[PDB]
Design an enzyme around this catalytic site. Structure first.
Site, PDB file in Angstrom:
ATOM      1  N   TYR A  45      41.212  77.209  58.843  1.00  0.00           N
ATOM      2  CA  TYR A  45      40.275  76.116  59.001  1.00  0.00           C
ATOM      3  C   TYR A  45      40.383  75.152  57.820  1.00  0.00           C
ATOM      4  O   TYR A  45      40.760  75.541  56.717  1.00  0.00           O
ATOM      5  CB  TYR A  45      38.849  76.665  59.118  1.00  0.00           C
ATOM      6  CG  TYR A  45      38.215  77.164  57.823  1.00  0.00           C
ATOM      7  CD1 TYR A  45      38.351  78.482  57.380  1.00  0.00           C
ATOM      8  CD2 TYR A  45      37.464  76.300  57.034  1.00  0.00           C
ATOM      9  CE1 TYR A  45      37.771  78.903  56.189  1.00  0.00           C
ATOM     10  CE2 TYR A  45      36.897  76.705  55.836  1.00  0.00           C
ATOM     11  CZ  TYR A  45      37.042  78.012  55.419  1.00  0.00           C
ATOM     12  OH  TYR A  45      36.448  78.348  54.242  1.00  0.00           O
ATOM     13  N   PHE A  55      35.017  69.638  50.174  1.00  0.00           N
ATOM     14  CA  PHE A  55      36.022  70.029  51.128  1.00  0.00           C
ATOM     15  C   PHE A  55      36.359  71.495  50.857  1.00  0.00           C
ATOM     16  O   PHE A  55      36.202  71.981  49.741  1.00  0.00           O
ATOM     17  CB  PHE A  55      37.120  68.978  50.925  1.00  0.00           C
ATOM     18  CG  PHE A  55      38.272  69.090  51.913  1.00  0.00           C
ATOM     19  CD1 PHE A  55      39.255  70.068  51.760  1.00  0.00           C
ATOM     20  CD2 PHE A  55      38.364  68.229  53.007  1.00  0.00           C
ATOM     21  CE1 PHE A  55      40.296  70.176  52.678  1.00  0.00           C
ATOM     22  CE2 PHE A  55      39.408  68.342  53.928  1.00  0.00           C
ATOM     23  CZ  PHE A  55      40.374  69.309  53.755  1.00  0.00           C
ATOM     24  N   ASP A  56      36.798  72.203  51.899  1.00  0.00           N
ATOM     25  CA  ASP A  56      37.126  73.613  51.797  1.00  0.00           C
ATOM     26  C   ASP A  56      38.222  73.944  52.804  1.00  0.00           C
ATOM     27  O   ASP A  56      38.247  73.381  53.900  1.00  0.00           O
ATOM     28  CB  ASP A  56      35.889  74.468  52.054  1.00  0.00           C
ATOM     29  CG  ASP A  56      36.173  75.958  52.124  1.00  0.00           C
ATOM     30  OD1 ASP A  56      36.781  76.480  51.168  1.00  0.00           O
ATOM     31  OD2 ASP A  56      35.805  76.587  53.139  1.00  0.00           O
ATOM     32  N   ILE A  71      28.086  80.683  60.322  1.00  0.00           N
ATOM     33  CA  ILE A  71      27.076  79.787  60.850  1.00  0.00           C
ATOM     34  C   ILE A  71      27.136  79.861  62.377  1.00  0.00           C
ATOM     35  O   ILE A  71      28.208  80.112  62.942  1.00  0.00           O
ATOM     36  CB  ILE A  71      27.265  78.354  60.325  1.00  0.00           C
ATOM     37  CG1 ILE A  71      28.649  77.774  60.643  1.00  0.00           C
ATOM     38  CG2 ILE A  71      26.932  78.257  58.841  1.00  0.00           C
ATOM     39  CD1 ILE A  71      28.806  76.341  60.192  1.00  0.00           C
ATOM     40  N   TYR A  97      23.335  74.938  58.252  1.00  0.00           N
ATOM     41  CA  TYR A  97      22.557  75.420  57.120  1.00  0.00           C
ATOM     42  C   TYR A  97      21.149  74.827  57.088  1.00  0.00           C
ATOM     43  O   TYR A  97      20.398  75.099  56.163  1.00  0.00           O
ATOM     44  CB  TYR A  97      23.288  75.118  55.806  1.00  0.00           C
ATOM     45  CG  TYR A  97      24.608  75.867  55.703  1.00  0.00           C
ATOM     46  CD1 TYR A  97      24.625  77.219  55.387  1.00  0.00           C
ATOM     47  CD2 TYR A  97      25.829  75.238  55.949  1.00  0.00           C
ATOM     48  CE1 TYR A  97      25.809  77.927  55.310  1.00  0.00           C
ATOM     49  CE2 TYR A  97      27.029  75.938  55.868  1.00  0.00           C
ATOM     50  CZ  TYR A  97      27.021  77.286  55.527  1.00  0.00           C
ATOM     51  OH  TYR A  97      28.187  78.009  55.461  1.00  0.00           O
ATOM     52  N   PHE A 114      34.675  70.611  61.005  1.00  0.00           N
ATOM     53  CA  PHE A 114      35.737  71.575  60.794  1.00  0.00           C
ATOM     54  C   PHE A 114      36.898  71.334  61.747  1.00  0.00           C
ATOM     55  O   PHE A 114      36.738  70.929  62.895  1.00  0.00           O
ATOM     56  CB  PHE A 114      35.331  73.018  61.068  1.00  0.00           C
ATOM     57  CG  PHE A 114      34.314  73.603  60.106  1.00  0.00           C
ATOM     58  CD1 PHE A 114      32.963  73.378  60.285  1.00  0.00           C
ATOM     59  CD2 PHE A 114      34.721  74.411  59.055  1.00  0.00           C
ATOM     60  CE1 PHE A 114      32.051  73.934  59.423  1.00  0.00           C
ATOM     61  CE2 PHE A 114      33.795  74.968  58.201  1.00  0.00           C
ATOM     62  CZ  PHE A 114      32.464  74.716  58.380  1.00  0.00           C
TER      63      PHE A 114
HETATM   64  C1  LIG Z   1      31.991  86.339  54.698  1.00  0.00           C
HETATM   65  C2  LIG Z   1      31.892  85.409  55.908  1.00  0.00           C
HETATM   66  N1  LIG Z   1      31.512  84.059  55.325  1.00  0.00           N
HETATM   67  C3  LIG Z   1      30.528  83.223  55.750  1.00  0.00           C
HETATM   68  C4  LIG Z   1      30.601  82.131  54.970  1.00  0.00           C
HETATM   69  C5  LIG Z   1      29.642  80.927  55.060  1.00  0.00           C
HETATM   70  O1  LIG Z   1      30.305  79.758  55.564  1.00  0.00           O
HETATM   71  C6  LIG Z   1      30.463  79.651  56.933  1.00  0.00           C
HETATM   72  O2  LIG Z   1      29.930  80.438  57.731  1.00  0.00           O
HETATM   73  C7  LIG Z   1      31.196  78.495  57.415  1.00  0.00           C
HETATM   74  C8  LIG Z   1      32.035  78.839  58.614  1.00  0.00           C
HETATM   75  C9  LIG Z   1      33.164  79.742  58.208  1.00  0.00           C
HETATM   76  C10 LIG Z   1      33.984  79.089  57.085  1.00  0.00           C
HETATM   77  C11 LIG Z   1      33.199  78.744  55.903  1.00  0.00           C
HETATM   78  N2  LIG Z   1      32.010  77.940  56.319  1.00  0.00           N
HETATM   79  C12 LIG Z   1      31.491  76.947  55.608  1.00  0.00           C
HETATM   80  O3  LIG Z   1      30.429  76.423  55.907  1.00  0.00           O
HETATM   81  C13 LIG Z   1      32.178  76.531  54.327  1.00  0.00           C
HETATM   82  C14 LIG Z   1      31.797  77.470  53.298  1.00  0.00           C
HETATM   83  C15 LIG Z   1      32.809  78.154  52.608  1.00  0.00           C
HETATM   84  C16 LIG Z   1      32.526  79.063  51.601  1.00  0.00           C
HETATM   85  O4  LIG Z   1      33.481  79.789  50.889  1.00  0.00           O
HETATM   86  C17 LIG Z   1      34.819  79.739  51.379  1.00  0.00           C
HETATM   87  C18 LIG Z   1      31.194  79.279  51.245  1.00  0.00           C
HETATM   88  O5  LIG Z   1      30.892  80.142  50.191  1.00  0.00           O
HETATM   89  C19 LIG Z   1      30.637  81.499  50.515  1.00  0.00           C
HETATM   90  C20 LIG Z   1      30.160  78.576  51.878  1.00  0.00           C
HETATM   91  O6  LIG Z   1      28.909  78.882  51.394  1.00  0.00           O
HETATM   92  C21 LIG Z   1      27.779  78.525  52.183  1.00  0.00           C
HETATM   93  C22 LIG Z   1      30.454  77.673  52.927  1.00  0.00           C
HETATM   94  C23 LIG Z   1      31.751  75.076  53.876  1.00  0.00           C
HETATM   95  C24 LIG Z   1      32.296  74.041  54.874  1.00  0.00           C
HETATM   96  C25 LIG Z   1      31.802  72.669  54.389  1.00  0.00           C
HETATM   97  C26 LIG Z   1      32.540  72.309  53.064  1.00  0.00           C
HETATM   98  C27 LIG Z   1      31.942  73.289  51.947  1.00  0.00           C
HETATM   99  C28 LIG Z   1      32.144  74.787  52.430  1.00  0.00           C
HETATM  100  C29 LIG Z   1      31.587  82.280  54.056  1.00  0.00           C
HETATM  101  N3  LIG Z   1      32.156  83.457  54.296  1.00  0.00           N
END
Ligand SMILES: CCn1cc(COC(=O)[C@@H]2CCCCN2C(=O)[C@H](c2cc(OC)c(OC)c(OC)c2)C2CCCCC2)cn1
Length: 124
Positions: A45, A55-56, A71, A97, A114
């Site tokens: 992703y 960005f990530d 999420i 969130y 995404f």
């Molecule tokens: C262990 C499973 N996990 C759940 C997450 C929480 O994030 C998410 O559920 C969603 C969907 C799956 C990919 C990551 N993600 C995110 O929102 C990213 C994400 C990546 C993160 O780390 C890679 C993260 O830190 C744990 C985080 O914290 C809330 C959120 C986010 C995208 C917008 C740009 C900033 C990052 C991270 N790992």
């Protein structure tokens, strides 16, 4: 750009039909089968805030589908993807969130975008 295109042209894949998770397929998959709740799922992703401020990227991300490990938008969105598909998701804060956010990384009432590639999914 890709977020605007999804906003204007994406399928609403929320059950409640509230435009909270919008989808465009970018690259087609193989087979008919999309993953069931419980399946370990493997993806690449790219992700960003509408704010433009974070960005990530995976660039292999691993989670069990429909178990709230991610999420709500991902549990909905990836469940509709087939092996080898690439999709764009735009997500309102209710399916990410929410009003609380996840500070400091994610602000209050954030909209997320995404790009997701579904690599494979095995049964747990
Ligand atoms: C262990 C499973 N996990 C759940 C997450 C929480 O994030 C998410 O559920 C969603 C969907 C799956 C990919 C990551 N993600 C995110 O929102 C990213 C994400 C990546 C993160 O780390 C890679 C993260 O830190 C744990 C985080 O914290 C809330 C959120 C986010 C995208 C917008 C740009 C900033 C990052 C991270 N790992």
């Amino acid at each position: 750009g890709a977020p605007a295109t999804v906003t204007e042209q994406g399928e609403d894949i929320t059950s409640k039909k509230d435009r909270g998770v919008l989808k465009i397929v970018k690259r087609v998959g193989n087979g008919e089968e999309t993953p069931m709740i419980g399946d370990k799922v493997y993806v690449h992703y790219k992700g960003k805030l509408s704010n433009g401020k974070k960005f990530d990227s995976s660039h292999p991300f691993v989670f069990s589908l429909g178990k709230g490990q991610v999420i709500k938008a991902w549990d909905i969105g990836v469940a509709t993807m087939k092996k080898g598909e690439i999709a764009h998701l735009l997500i309102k804060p209710e399916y990410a969130y929410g009003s609380a956010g996840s500070l400091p990384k994610i602000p209050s009432n954030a909209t997320l975008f995404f790009e997701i590639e579904l690599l494979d999914f095995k049964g747990e």
